[PDB]
Scaffold this active site. Sequence first.
Site, PDB file in Angstrom:
ATOM      1  N   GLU A   1       4.999   4.789  11.633  1.00  0.00           N
ATOM      2  CA  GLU A   1       3.565   4.577  11.787  1.00  0.00           C
ATOM      3  C   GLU A   1       3.263   3.557  12.877  1.00  0.00           C
ATOM      4  OE1 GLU A   1       2.275   3.545   7.866  1.00  0.00           O
ATOM      5  OE2 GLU A   1       2.043   5.635   7.232  1.00  0.00           O
TER       6      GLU A   1
ATOM      7  N   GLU B   1       0.826  -1.203   0.000  1.00  0.00           N
ATOM      8  CA  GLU B   1       0.000   0.000   0.000  1.00  0.00           C
ATOM      9  C   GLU B   1       0.863   1.256   0.000  1.00  0.00           C
ATOM     10  OE1 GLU B   1      -3.013   0.014   3.082  1.00  0.00           O
ATOM     11  OE2 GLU B   1      -3.251   2.189   2.902  1.00  0.00           O
ATOM     12  N   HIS B   2       1.996   1.220   0.707  1.00  0.00           N
ATOM     13  CA  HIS B   2       2.914   2.352   0.710  1.00  0.00           C
ATOM     14  C   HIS B   2       3.615   2.541  -0.629  1.00  0.00           C
ATOM     15  CE1 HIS B   2       2.170   2.434   4.958  1.00  0.00           C
ATOM     16  NE2 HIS B   2       3.080   3.367   5.172  1.00  0.00           N
TER      17      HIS B   2
END
Lengths: 52, 49, 34, 61, 446, 54, 425, 105, 54
Positions: free
Chosen positions: E137, E60-61
């Site tokens: 994160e 996703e990154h």
Amino acid sequence: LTRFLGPRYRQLARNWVPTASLWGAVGAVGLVWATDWRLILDWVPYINGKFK
Amino acid sequence: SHTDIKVPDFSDYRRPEVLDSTKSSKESSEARKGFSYLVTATTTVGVAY
Amino acid sequence: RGVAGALRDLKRSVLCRESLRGQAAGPLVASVSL
Amino acid sequence: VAPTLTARLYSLLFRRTSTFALTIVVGALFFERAFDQGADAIYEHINEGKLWKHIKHKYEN
Amino acid sequence: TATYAQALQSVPETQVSQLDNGLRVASEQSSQPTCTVGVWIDAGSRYESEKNNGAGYFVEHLAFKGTKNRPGNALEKEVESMGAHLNAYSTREHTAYYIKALSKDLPKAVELLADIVQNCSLEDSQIEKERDVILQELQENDTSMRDVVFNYLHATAFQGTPLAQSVEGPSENVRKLSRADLTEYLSRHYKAPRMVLAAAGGLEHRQLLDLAQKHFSGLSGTYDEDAVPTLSPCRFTGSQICHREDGLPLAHVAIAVEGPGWAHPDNVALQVANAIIGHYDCTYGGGAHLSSPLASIAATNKLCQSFQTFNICYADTGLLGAHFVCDHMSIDDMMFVLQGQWMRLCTSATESEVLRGKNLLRNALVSHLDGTTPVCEDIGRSLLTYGRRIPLAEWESRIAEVDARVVREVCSKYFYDQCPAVAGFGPIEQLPDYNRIRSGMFWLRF
Amino acid sequence: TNIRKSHPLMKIVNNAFIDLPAPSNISSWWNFGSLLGICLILQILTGLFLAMHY
Amino acid sequence: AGVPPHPQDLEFTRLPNGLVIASLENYAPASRIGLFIKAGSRYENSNNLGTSHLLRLASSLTTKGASSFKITRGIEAVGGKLSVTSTRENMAYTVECLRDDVDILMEFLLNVTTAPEFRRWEVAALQPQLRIDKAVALQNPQAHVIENLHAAAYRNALANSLYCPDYRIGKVTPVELHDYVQNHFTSARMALIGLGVSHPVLKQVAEQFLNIRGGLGLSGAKAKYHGGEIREQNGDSLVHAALVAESAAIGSAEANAFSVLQHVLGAGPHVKRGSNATSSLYQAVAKGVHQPFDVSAFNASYSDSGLFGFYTISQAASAGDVIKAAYNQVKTIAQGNLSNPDVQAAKNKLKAGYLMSVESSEGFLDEVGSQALAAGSYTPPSTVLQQIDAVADADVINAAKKFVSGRKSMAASGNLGHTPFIDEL
Amino acid sequence: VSASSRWLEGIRKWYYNAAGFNKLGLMRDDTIHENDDVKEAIRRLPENLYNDRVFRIKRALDLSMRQQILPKEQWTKYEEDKSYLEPYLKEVIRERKEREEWAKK
Amino acid sequence: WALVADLLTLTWIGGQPVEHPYITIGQLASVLYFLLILVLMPTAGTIENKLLKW
Ligand SMILES: CCCCCCCCCCCCCC(=O)OC[C@H](COP(=O)([O-])OCC[N+](C)(C)C)OC(=O)CCCCCCCCCCCCC
Ligand code: HEM
Ligand SMILES: CCCCCC(=O)OC[C@H](COP(=O)([O-])OCCN)OC(=O)CCCCC
Ligand SMILES: CCCCCC(=O)OC[C@H](COP(=O)([O-])OCCN)OC(=O)CCCCC
């Protein structure tokens, strides 16, 4: 006194009738067993061990 | 870092019906609860006598 | 639930530069409900 | 194979606490007779010919 | 003049089509000038193993950081320059990438989603950049007690199974994840029979299906190899995880039982029961006069800052329960009132409050499907879970079937005398012992 | 909130036999507290029933 | 086939008493009714500060037609909703429910807005909620910075905070609430907006109940821009800072120029975890700053004034480098360095964002309600895009010039040891 | 309005002076028994009426200690007995009746 | 005080033989006891409420 007269309060009585009827059987059978009540026990098949 | 927190393995303690991590536990919930409550019921039947 | 909009219990931390984008304002609005 | 006996004992008798009690009070009634009957049979057997109920028939009339 | 029942019939049918490579293409047309389009993939942490856990969250990154035809900034500049918005998310069972844009920008939007899902660059220089970003994160998520306590709940409830794994993965796997691990994850799971191209807004289904053939045709589909993934069942475990930390000012508690899963019809009746219990926050205006007895008592006696019910659904399993946060001396009272409402609904639910739960659900369902992006999500997720779009008129039929008897039977089937999964975090000295919690799942009077 | 905690009578029983925080590791030598209580009650019942005839 | 019906038009009507009714029948399963009122915090003065906050929190207190108990239970019974949204200019009482229950929630809405009793004991019990509401809001550092930004910019009437001052919590009286409703909840200050409702019933309701004659006329208490700066030394980890100048009142053509200038500079991202290439402010700061930060153009347009500028988040030591870099980036646009492709991409972000912000009934109702009070009319979206296209490159430049040369207002919070004052920029 | 309604009022003034709480300076609503409805109504009284109620009860309890009463000039006149609590108690009861009617549905 | 005097009557009747007229007086006093507690004294409290207009 008349707070408990309505649709919801009759629905609550309906939901607890099967339970309240079973606790009465638990109390009734518990009273007959605790006292050896021969009026009721003489009709049960295996607990006829009285020999009158 | 809290994503590093894995739960330890209880395989030494789990009952036989709960060893397989790919089988649902609902299939044995009634039997497992019934056994421990049968122990309680038989215990109360003894004290009642 | 109460809302505060501006972009047009310890809450959390925002450290990196990717999570910071969108935090800068862009006129406050206060909403309240039941 | 249908679910085990303990599984059908749970859903049928032990789930509700009211039936869980009715099972116990009914199980107490039959357990008392079956245990007193069996237990007395062990006491009299170990003491055969010694208790009064064994020598009772000799003095009927 | 139109009634509520008639308005449910006016919603356009959701047209569904399927390419020759297994890619499903679904749309709901409207008169809007904007639209939302995206790709919903049947991938997530539940498919990942312990060695490659967090690989999807890593991808996703990298999905928006460059492609073979649009390297680096090129993708962002195209999206930004046409005023569109590009977003993505990943749960334990679903991954999604969707664009919000004008209706006239439909062909460019679909073209970008194809280039993203198929031709991801995954430059080694970028992977090392996102390595540090995900690690930051992870430190950020540690400060959100809500995210922590729900990861703990999954960790203990589904212990020993893939569902125990969090989406982000452990800090050690993000540090040792190689480019080969990620490409292996993509070729394995990003396969056309496992994806759904969903759209919603002002657009005809024809041009969506044409664009689907135009850009997604070049994707191996309907027979990859003898490497088919299949989700096995996941054992639920009655258990407790307690992270004692008296430095935090409020405790977080999440308690739940095993839910049935996506396709089970019982979810409708469960959501009605959860709606009766509802949710509370210290900013609500109602307070003492609220209908939910838990919310009324929580506001009157100040037992919590908030609580929420939930019915989390996974394939053939789920987490059904509630989560709250409160002062360290209110954890026992809050647990007592909560369990008392589960038992009250299991045994003695009444007709009026059940109608409220049905009305809360009807309002929740229609208020949520307002906008192109909610509807596009409902299309994509439903095609993966239900294999179809369940019309609003069908949800109304299943809601209207629920009555007090259904709630008593359905709640007892999942709550009464069941082992919960408990997760705690914060000042939880007063959190009840698990045996006491387990005893709160039945009533001796019943 | 909870009847067991707020009633003037039940709160004494609750804070003595139910919700009392006790150590997790007390051994069998801590059972003799309750056993002394049982013996005292047991001696009073039998003691009374003997006083009906002594 | 699967196509939708023919979408109806919005009905719009002005009554002679000043009231504005606007309705749209979208045939949705839900209905939504909003009463928008020119009663925001700007109509407070230094003797009744916070009265509109406590009023915003008192929507479920007892009315003449419905007790507090009935309002809560009556709305929850149908699964409905009652909300109160406030800006510095407007209060908006919104009500939502399934379309078969519009009548019930309409009755509650009118009672809350036109027959509140404000009982002495009910109001007293509600005072501590001001402290809880304000505390939840002010844990976003953006909220207090923008409170101080307005306190610094204006002498009156927009310096007033959206939240009640601490010294006033517990001091707001029921008389002040009655006086606030009588003065501001009047026909010429109101607009009745409805979705999933017919135009006759709203117009009928408007004429039966919403005919409250003005206790206070449309006030000429114009906001007076003054400028200044408020600095809050605290223990936050990052410095928040907003630098702003007076820009333009809403609805004017100059306002559209600032809205385009906002998207030329950058205001909020478009891509999850994106480098924000097309944001000239972000790229300008990223040149000389390699730490984590954020920067965004700020645009706040009101009835008789406006504030345009930018908002920064940075480490305490980089606060001056970020602000000066951003401010210099606005100067280069004021010096003329602005291409035509740059302005077109900004118009696309603006035009696209406006349309997206009215996809939902929540965003559509709020737009129609705000237009009714601000403009007394409804401007359809195609006309809004037409007005955005009419913005010239020179208009965007002159808006940047107005910012650079204008008397500044600044608010900052954090460790401010390296945060410049205005005269140091 | 008529001579007969003055006789009903006549016996009410008789019972009032027979009840004798006016001899201690009290009013009729000072003597009411505090149930939950009454406690809420007292809670809702404005500051001045609450402080007046408190001192009259305090003064009457002081007299009851000494087994004394006030001079006849300071007794509470039947015509001047202010039902300061009845409007508050009527509203508390009306709200409870509404809660009790919703509980029936 | 009618309850006290009626109880002072039952006390007096209790220490006397069961003969005329003590039989009739003891029955009247017995009914008056339960009538005062169950019927009359509750009814007086209601009359007293009406005289005070509440
Ligand atoms: C006048 C005539 C009246 C006669 C009446 C006769 C009635 C006979 C007893 C029947 C009542 C049963 C109540 C019951 O069954 O509810 C007690 C409790 C439940 O059991 P549970 O936790 O499985 O939950 C149960 C969860 N379910 C229901 C979902 C499976 O039973 C237990 O827990 C406690 C069991 C342990 C027994 C020892 C206690 C005696 C004290 C010490 C003795 C030695 C020294 C003095
Ligand atoms: C701590 C409590 C008590 C202790 C330790 C205790 C101890 C004893 C002992 C050791 C005996 C001698 C019994 C024998 O040798 O046959 C005795 C006798 C007796 N006790 Fe107690 N007792 C207690 C409580 C009571 C109470 C409360 C009563 C009366 C209510 C009572 C009534 C009697 C009677 C009547 C006897 C004579 C009958 C006999 O010798 O068996 N006891 N007691
Ligand atoms: C509350 C105290 C009750 C005391 C009763 C007693 O001691 O037992 C007498 C009988 C014995 O059983 P029976 O079949 O001989 O019956 C012989 C009948 N005399 O048991 C009963 O019948 C139980 C009756 C319960 C009524 C409350
Ligand atoms: C005449 C019968 C009386 C029955 C009372 C009873 O059994 O008490 C409750 C507990 C088990 O229930 P719980 O503590 O799980 O609570 C369940 C909450 N839903 O049982 C025990 O372990 C307590 C020991 C009692 C000793 C006298």
